[PDB]
Amino acid sequence: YEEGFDPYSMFTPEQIMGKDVRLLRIKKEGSLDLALEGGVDSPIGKVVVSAVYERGAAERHGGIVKGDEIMAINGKIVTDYTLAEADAALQKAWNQGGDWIDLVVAVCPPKEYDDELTFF
Amino acid sequence: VRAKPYTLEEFSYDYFRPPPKHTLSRVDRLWSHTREPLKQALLKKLLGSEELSQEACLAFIAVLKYMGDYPSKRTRSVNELTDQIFEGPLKAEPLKDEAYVQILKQLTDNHIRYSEERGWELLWLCTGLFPPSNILLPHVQRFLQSRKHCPLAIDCLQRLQKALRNGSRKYPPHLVEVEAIQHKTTQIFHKVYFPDDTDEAFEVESSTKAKDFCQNIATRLLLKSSEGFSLFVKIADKVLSVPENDFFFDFVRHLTDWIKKARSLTYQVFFMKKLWTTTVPGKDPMADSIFHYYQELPKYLRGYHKCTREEVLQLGALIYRVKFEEDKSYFPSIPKLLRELVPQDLIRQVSPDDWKRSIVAYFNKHAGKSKEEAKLAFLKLIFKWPTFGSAFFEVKQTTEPNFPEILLIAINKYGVSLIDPKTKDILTTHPFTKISNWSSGNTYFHITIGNSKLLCETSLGYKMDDLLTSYISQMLTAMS
């Protein structure tokens, strides 16, 4: 299963240096409800989760959160994809073929700072 | 003979679609009330426009439903039918005149009293969203002027004037607008919250723009200037500033609509200092009294500033004085109220009773000063610091290698400052004049310096972006 995934079969030690790389095999029921942001072009220079909507599929699985990095979609590495290239690949993996979607993600570490309140 | 009330009969002859060719052969006027849905838009202009005629017929079934002239249900939202009526004209100009002629038609020779009372609510809602064209406007005015005895006719005429002046709305009527007119009340009052833990009810109209609203609050509060002040909407988690030229009801409606897509839809309207450029303590007594002290106090207590022990004892004794004035009966309560008197990070540096003894000594040095004088004395001491009037953000920076990963970012009149969170030392200040570009996402905030790039990991990029945009705009317009 997903607990039996080796990220070194897909990535070089330099590629996943310090990253916590996991495999998520999402169910494939209705809407994926997972938004992306970034792209190779962008300031962050990677594909990250911008929102996991409460409705389901990505939320129902629970393995993926806002800030996590999308590294591969159905075996195809998406690290140097643009935002439009990534969104197209994510939708095409969800709509076209299979009974599941295979997402390789770099799990974002806990926020070591107050990222909620602002005093004006 | 007394003149009958004005109808769209004469207007219809030139601007309504002609009657079907079979009409004359047949030995229920287009400009008069029906219970029969339209199959084609009223206006001759929409004849060719298939997509627009379609939307005009959908909005008319919503006008029928609202007025009880078409079956519906015990509808969930008070604004479910009114959104269907106005979403069309708000997204397309040709549909704006269709909205008026449809409503006016349904108010012309309407036998049903329940129906006619509901159509009036719709015309009142319409007059606060957008005016009719220059061609139609006189007819709408003559329609209203000949029906002065109807309780909403003079208000619709008044709203028309405000709609011609302020321009058109972008979002359908808010639930407070719909509930007000259904409750037979044309005046709306909205609560506004201030940093001094008080609130007040201010009158709001459909045409109210955040700038006018801000000016009425400023006038009320006897402020010397409304410059740097702004409305803020606190909904769910989010706290957004309201753009100066935005319609108050459009901002709230859109923000609540947006929150509803990702989901209690309860909001709070705040008035606060946003930009601190022109702020000088002593200049404006009410601005200092209500806003400046109360806004700078929690920033200070979070430990965002670099201060000496002499200053924390002085400010501690000054806070006590704002809270209890000359009363010394809350002196033994200083250990219990330390989180309210001393910055978070320094509390552990000294025992609760050593703080109590030091604060009690400094208070007696502040003579017989009032709660108000104490607010100014606190402000004047902190105005000496380069971090006064800042917006502080805790971020994870990914671009600077000599700087810590966790940074404290202060956005104030001097630009963007990167502060060491531990020492409270300013590592660098990037003036607004040296900031060439910026962007934000849900997980970041980026700034380009010159022809140097800074990437911050944050969920507050939207706020930072707004502040950077507002400060740079303020300066750029001041340079004219």
Numbering used by the authors:
A (entry chain B): 433 to 552
B (entry chain A): 1707 to 1733, 1742 to 1977, 1986 to 2173, 2178 to 2206
Which statements did the authors publish about this structure?
Myo7 is a crucial component of the tripartite complex that maintains the necessary mechanical tension across the cadherin links. The Myo7 tail domain consists of two MyTH4-FERM (MF; myosin tail homology 4; band 4.1, ezrin, radixin, moesin) domains separated by an SH3 domain. Harmonin plays a pivotal role due to its ability to interact with cadherin as well as all other components of the complex. The results presented here reveal nearly identical interactions between members of the Myo7/harmonin-a/SANS:ANKS4B tripartite complexes that link cadherins to the actin-rich core in stereocilia and microvilli. Both Myo7a and Myo7b MF2 domains bind to harmonin-a PDZ3c with similar affinities via a novel mode.
Consistent with this sequence conservation, PDZ3c binds to Myo7a MF2 with ∼1 μM affinity, the same affinity as the Myo7b MF2/PDZ3c interaction. The structure of Myo7a MF2 bound to harmonin PDZ3c was determined at 2.6 Å resolution. Comparison with the PDZ3c/Myo7b MF2 structure results in an r.m.s.d. of 1.20 Å (for 411 Cα atoms) despite the low-sequence identity (51%) between the two MF2 domains and major differences in the crystal packing environments. The harmonin PDZ3c binds in the same overall manner by inserting the Cter motif into Myo7a MF2’s central FERM cavity. However, the Cter motif adopts a slightly different conformation in the two complexes, namely residues Leu549 and Thr550 interact distinctively in the two FERM cavities due to the Tyr2026Myo7a/Phe1923Myo7b variation. Such slight adaptability of the FERM groove results mainly from conformational variability in the F1 lobe. The affinities of PDZ3c for either Myo7a or Myo7b MF2 are similar despite these changes, showing that some adaptation of the binding mode in this FERM cavity can occur without much cost in affinity. However, several deafness mutations suggest the importance of this domain for the integrity of stereocilia. In light of the new structures, 25 missense mutations of Myo7a MF2 that cause deafness were mapped onto the structure to assess their potential impact on binding to partners. However, mutations affecting three surface residues (K2118N, G2163S, G1982E/R) suggest a role for the surface next to the F1H2-S5 loop and the F3 lobe in making specific interactions with partners. Interestingly, these four mutations significantly weaken the interaction with PDZ3c, suggesting the importance of the Myo7a MF2/harmonin PDZ3c interactions in hearing and a functional role for harmonin-a.
